[PDB]
Structures are given as C-alpha cells and as structure tokens.
Amino acid sequence: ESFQFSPSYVDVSSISNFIIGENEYHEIQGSIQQVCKDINRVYLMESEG
Amino acid sequence: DDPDFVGADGGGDPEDIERIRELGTIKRETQQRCVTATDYDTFVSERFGSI
Amino acid sequence: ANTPVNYQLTRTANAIPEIFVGGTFAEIKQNLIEWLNGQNEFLDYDFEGSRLNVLCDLLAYNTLYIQQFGNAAVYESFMRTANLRSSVVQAAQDNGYLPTSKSAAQTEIMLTCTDALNRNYITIPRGTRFLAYAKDTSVNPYNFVSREDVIAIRDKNNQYFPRLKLAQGRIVRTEIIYDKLTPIIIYDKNIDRNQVKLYVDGAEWINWTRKSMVHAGSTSTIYYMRETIDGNTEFYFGEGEISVNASEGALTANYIGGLKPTQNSTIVIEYISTNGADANGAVGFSYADTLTNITVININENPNDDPDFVGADGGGDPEDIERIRELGTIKRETQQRCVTATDYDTFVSERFGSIIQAVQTFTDSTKPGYAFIAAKPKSGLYLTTVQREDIKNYLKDYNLAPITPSIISPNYLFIKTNLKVTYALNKLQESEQWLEGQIIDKIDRYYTEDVEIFNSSFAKSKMLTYVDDADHSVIGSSATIQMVREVQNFYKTPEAGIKYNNQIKDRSMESNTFSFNSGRKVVNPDTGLEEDVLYDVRIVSTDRDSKGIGKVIIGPFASGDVTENENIQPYTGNDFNKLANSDGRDKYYVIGEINYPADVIYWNIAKINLTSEKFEVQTIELYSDPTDDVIFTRDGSLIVFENDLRPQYLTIDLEPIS
C-alpha cells in the first residue's frame, strides 16, 4: 500500500523500492553421515534442488 | 496524479473566530470511542465504504 | 477510632480561592488602614486621628463597593459557585446540558370514535385540543392538544378506537423569514424546549440535542437553543460548514452552511406554551376539537392501566438551581451517549427531570443486559407504564447496544401515621379546617426537604418539627408511625423474604385483614345458591422467640376449612396476636417465619397447601412498628410521602383547645 502509481514512471527501481515482496533467509537442514569412516572427511555441496 | 490538480493545498485563517465556535461546539460532543450501534458503522464505513 | 489524619484531603469541600471573599467593611478598612500605614511616603501620619481616618474610611467604602462586583462575578464566573441561575444554565448549556422550561403536562388517551363517513382510515391530525379539568376542580378544564397525527383502522362493526398521547397547552406555530443579521427570539413564556419543533421551508430540523440525533440526516439538518437572560428562548443553528467539515460525503465538496437566507428557507416553528405543573392529575377529559366526520362516542381514560394513575403529567416549575447545578458536570463529564450508571442517572434527569424528582440507576447483578432504574414520578411513586416505556425507548436511544434499559419502581416503605396536634381556638381566627390543609402541605415539605433526597435514615420527630412549625397557634403536635411495606404476593414471600432494615418490636409485626374464600357453603332465605362461604384473615407474627425469631401465624380459620395434615397443625400457641372475628374460629397455622434481628420475613402458603386462588386479592399491605426512633433505608427501599393517592397511610387528628 501507500504509493500511488498513476501514469507516472519509466523507472523499474523506484517501484522496486518496495514492490512489497519478500527477502532472504537461512535454514539448517538435517544431520550428516560420513561417506566413509569420518564425517570431518566429507564435504558438502548443494545445487538449488 | 489523477487528472485533477492545483499547484498546492492548505491554508486557512486558521481560526475564523465565529466559525470555530461550532467546531468547539462540536468536538465537545465527539467520541474517539465507539458505542451504541450507529456510532460504529459511521466510523466503520469511514473505512472502505468503497467495499 | 473515627478518622486519624496525615495532613489529609484538600481545601475544605470546594474551592474558595478566598482572596476574593468579601470581608467586613471595618476589617476591610482594618486591613487597608494598615496598608496606607507603613507606606514609605509617610511613616508619620497617625490614622486613628479621626481626620485621616474618615478619609481613608471612604476609600474602603468604594473599595468594598467595588469588591462585591469583583467577587460576585467570580461566584458567577465559576459554575457551582454561580449564584445566578440564568448563569448556571449558561455554563451548563455550555457543558452540553441545559435545564428546560416547564414541560407540558402529558398523557395518552385511547378513544373509541365512530367516523360518520365510514372511511377505512381517519387520521387524528396533529393539533386537536382536548380539555381536562384539574383534579377535583371542574371550574376550568386544562386544554391540551393532540401531540401528533395518528390514524386508525376501521374495525368491523364500524366502531374503532384510535389511541394517541396528549401534552398540555396549545400548538403555537410561527413562521419567520430567516435573515443573516438578527436574533430569532420567541418571547413566549410557558414555552418548553422539549415540545418545540420547527420547519425550515419544508423539512423539519432537530436541535441535535435530545431530539433523535442519531439518524441518517447527516447533521446538515440541525439547530440550537439558548436562553436569553430575559427568560425567553431564542433560536440558533450552526452557520457555515454546518456539517462536520469540508468534502465529507459529497463529491462536489465546496461549502454549504445553509440558510443564506436571502429569503431562502423561511423558518416556521411550532410549539406549545403550557400552564403545567398545575395540571398534574387531570382525570376528566373532553374531546375539545371537532374534525370532519369524526365523532368520539367514548374517550376512556388510561389504556393499559397501572392501575394506580392520575391525569396527565409533566408541567414543571421549570427551574431549580440545586438539582441543576452540580448535575450538568456529570453531563460535562459524560459524553452525550450515556454510559455510566450515574450517567444514566443524570441523562434521565435531563428529559423527564420534571417527571422525576429522583431517579436511581443501578445494575441488578442477576440480569445483565438490563439497566435497572428506580425513579420518582414526583407526582407519585409509579410512572405509568407508557412513561416507563416512553423514556425507556428514548433513553434507549443513548445506551450500549446489547444493554437494555429496565425501569421498575422499587418497593417503598410507607410511614403510616395518626397525628395529634393541638391549637388554641382563640389564638387562631383562621378557619380550623384550613389549618389541617396547611400542615398537610408542610408534612411533605420535610420529605421534599429531606427524605427522598438521600433516602437516608428518617427522623419522625424531625419531620414533626415543621408540622409543629405550621401555625405557631398550634399548641402541640403528636404522631405515631407504623412502618408499612406493600407485598406483591400474599401467597409466597419473595424468595429473599422481606427485611425492614429497621428493628421492630416483636409481635408488633402485623398485616392487612383480607377475605379468604372457603369451600364451605352458605345459603340464606332469598339468597339461594350463594356460592360458598368466604371469611377474612390477616398475617400475624407470633412473639419473639429466643434467637430473635418468630413464626408467621396465619389469620383465624374455621374448622374444616383447611384439611388437617399430620405435618401441619393449628399453631394454637398462647402468644400470637389475633383479630376478633364473629366466627370465633381458633384455627391458626404457621405459614412461615421471621427473625427480628435480621428483620427478614418469610412465609409460603404452599406450606399450608391452601390454594392461591381461594384468596381474592393478590397484593396485601404490610404493617409493622419499628422499635427504633428513626427509620433506616438502604437500597431501593425508601420511605416517602404520598398522601393523596394513599391517604389511609396518612392520618391527622386535630385537637381544638381554647
């Protein structure tokens, strides 16, 4: 809410100032198993999926 | 904007010493609270009578 | 014990800034005479030298002359210090509450009238006037006029009653061309602002202010009252942005205050000036204005009978400074809409203030959603059910939505008294009888002076003072009180019973004698069938019992009247008081019991199994003699003076002495 739009603007960004919308966050996921014999050994990768 | 415009708004005597009497004669009657029934809807429909 | 203190409370009961207080002239001088003294210019001049003294003496005279101006204005300046009444209204009017002019004697009638034309619907147009003689005096009727239009269905058989309610006076309507610069006065005395209604050109506007005031009318329709200091009312309405402000609901906005006028909106107002407060209790009515084709075949008093009622209502003084003075502060305190219990007290006090000497707003914690009200019709103890309904709905206008107003006249302690008052014949040339007519005023004077106000402890003797004070040719005055309550059910005590709040002598608890229908048969030559026998009984207290208790002894019973049960026996005690009957019937039962210390009194006729209907009368009056001097009141139980409606409760013996 707030801002009037109206025939107004070329700019994409001034509107992006707030589209409303939503922002970033982190989350922690699951425990881990070692591939072999130690977990400190193993390393992580996550592609988005 | 809408296609209705003047360069600026705001102004006023402010007082209009007589005209204010009413206003004083009025607001003494006013409530910020809502009570009875029709007090509400008035104040209510002040919001989104558009809806 | 009593009140210990740390430097407590504040500044007496009420502010007196008291630099303002008018002092005694000599002291004023005495103060001022010091003032000139010590004046650096001269420490020499002796003031008690009579030469300067009278000179300074004069300064104080003006200084006192001028002060009461300066001081009184302050009393004036501050409501509740205001000594002028027309002052008091102003701040009160300013506070959003006004006292009103004498408020027309009002009533309702239903009248059965045949239309000669036999049209489906006749209206009674607003403004037909009827006559009512004041009580007991037919020398003149009091005119009173149809309040408003009303129409009636023609019943079949062609006769049908309309009903309508009636306020006293004459409709008086005056058109005025409104003009910018001008006062709008009505110089009419006997006017009352509550019966004032008006028309701008066409539509009616309401002074927001206790006419409607919550409706879609958008507030553009409106106006005010005011009291000219003269005693006559002037009209007023808001000018310019007459609605709250600006654009509001209109899309075009701009500005409208209305009433330009130029000639626009020629203002026509319509009102009733009245003779009221003199007209209360006007029973006999006339149909005092004819209409086309309508003929009243009967006008029958008081639909939906109380049953105890009087003619009309209302009137009013109008003015009392005391009830008015503090009061508007609560309305100054409260908003328009009434919220607080005492807000319902004061609000009710506005309209029907001349109907109500005192109104008691309270909750009954049992029933929520109901505003419980105990008021004084101030003509009598019982507002006729229409009034109750009337103000209710009107009251109900200002209220919380789920809340309902509930008005009941509370129970009333009655002081039943024979008076013994002596006077010297010679000492009074004045007509003896009229003396009684004198005292009988001064009796309620005390009441109105005292008792209804707080409904506090009641002093018999102190009452007898003013009646003593009456003729001063009265040589002596004596009286004896019987504390009296009224009972709604003879059959079953109210659950809680009944309490006196006041210690009574044992065995001094009495009641009224009343017949009882007994199934047993009576026949007398020429009488024939004769239904059955009925005899009378009354409620009797037995003696005090240890632990201050007593059992309620029923009136005497003939043999075979009451089926004897192994449980219930003729009480047949020695003590209990007994009426003397020709029957000699000695059967007496305990119908219930009491205790004197708690003053609480219970019985049930279900106990004796005797049928309610074999009693003729539903209510009985209660007799008791409080052992104590003065009568204590608590809640909803108030002693009061109504002689006219209930003279049997008030009696006076007159002792002529040479």
Tab-separated table of N, CA and C in Angstrom, chain C residues 16 89 116 142 150 159 175 177 215 224 255 298 322 329 346 394 516 543 604 618 620 636:
chain	number	residue	atom	x	y	z
C	16	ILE	N	-12.644	27.770	47.399
C	16	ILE	CA	-12.872	29.196	47.599
C	16	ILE	C	-11.499	29.850	47.595
C	89	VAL	N	-27.367	27.841	33.977
C	89	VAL	CA	-27.704	27.212	32.708
C	89	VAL	C	-26.613	27.471	31.684
C	116	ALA	N	-68.367	9.310	10.958
C	116	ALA	CA	-69.628	9.400	10.240
C	116	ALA	C	-69.453	9.001	8.781
C	142	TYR	N	-58.204	22.124	31.742
C	142	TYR	CA	-56.932	22.476	31.144
C	142	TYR	C	-56.890	21.947	29.730
C	150	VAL	N	-52.323	10.682	14.082
C	150	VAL	CA	-52.497	9.248	14.271
C	150	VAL	C	-53.720	8.831	13.477
C	159	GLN	N	-67.182	0.567	14.521
C	159	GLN	CA	-66.593	1.386	15.564
C	159	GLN	C	-65.199	0.876	15.878
C	175	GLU	N	-44.123	31.137	11.660
C	175	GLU	CA	-43.154	31.225	10.591
C	175	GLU	C	-42.345	32.492	10.783
C	177	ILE	N	-39.268	34.604	8.416
C	177	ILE	CA	-38.208	34.686	7.432
C	177	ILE	C	-36.887	34.769	8.170
C	215	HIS	N	-29.498	9.507	13.318
C	215	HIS	CA	-30.236	9.129	12.123
C	215	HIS	C	-29.392	9.548	10.931
C	224	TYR	N	-29.773	25.050	17.353
C	224	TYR	CA	-29.588	25.037	18.796
C	224	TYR	C	-30.691	25.805	19.495
C	255	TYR	N	-18.707	24.390	-0.199
C	255	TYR	CA	-19.114	24.854	1.123
C	255	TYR	C	-20.629	25.021	1.161
C	298	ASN	N	-66.846	7.536	22.745
C	298	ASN	CA	-66.309	7.433	24.088
C	298	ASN	C	-64.831	7.782	24.058
C	322	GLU	N	-30.512	23.888	42.499
C	322	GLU	CA	-29.741	22.886	43.221
C	322	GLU	C	-29.622	21.599	42.429
C	329	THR	N	-22.367	18.898	35.376
C	329	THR	CA	-20.975	18.475	35.427
C	329	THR	C	-20.841	17.026	35.006
C	346	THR	N	-28.032	11.019	35.494
C	346	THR	CA	-28.090	12.400	35.029
C	346	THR	C	-28.801	12.522	33.684
C	394	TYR	N	-36.737	6.247	24.564
C	394	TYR	CA	-35.982	7.471	24.363
C	394	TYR	C	-34.618	7.380	25.014
C	516	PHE	N	-60.963	-14.599	52.737
C	516	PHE	CA	-60.476	-15.825	52.140
C	516	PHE	C	-61.670	-16.660	51.733
C	543	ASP	N	-44.912	-14.236	68.957
C	543	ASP	CA	-43.984	-13.472	69.759
C	543	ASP	C	-42.567	-13.679	69.258
C	604	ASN	N	-44.541	-19.160	53.147
C	604	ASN	CA	-45.130	-19.617	51.901
C	604	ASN	C	-46.472	-20.251	52.206
C	618	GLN	N	-54.440	-10.243	45.307
C	618	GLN	CA	-53.064	-10.616	45.018
C	618	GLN	C	-52.043	-9.889	45.886
C	620	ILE	N	-51.125	-7.467	49.363
C	620	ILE	CA	-51.550	-7.045	50.688
C	620	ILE	C	-50.554	-6.018	51.201
C	636	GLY	N	-33.253	0.766	47.456
C	636	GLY	CA	-34.488	0.572	46.727
C	636	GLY	C	-35.681	0.608	47.653
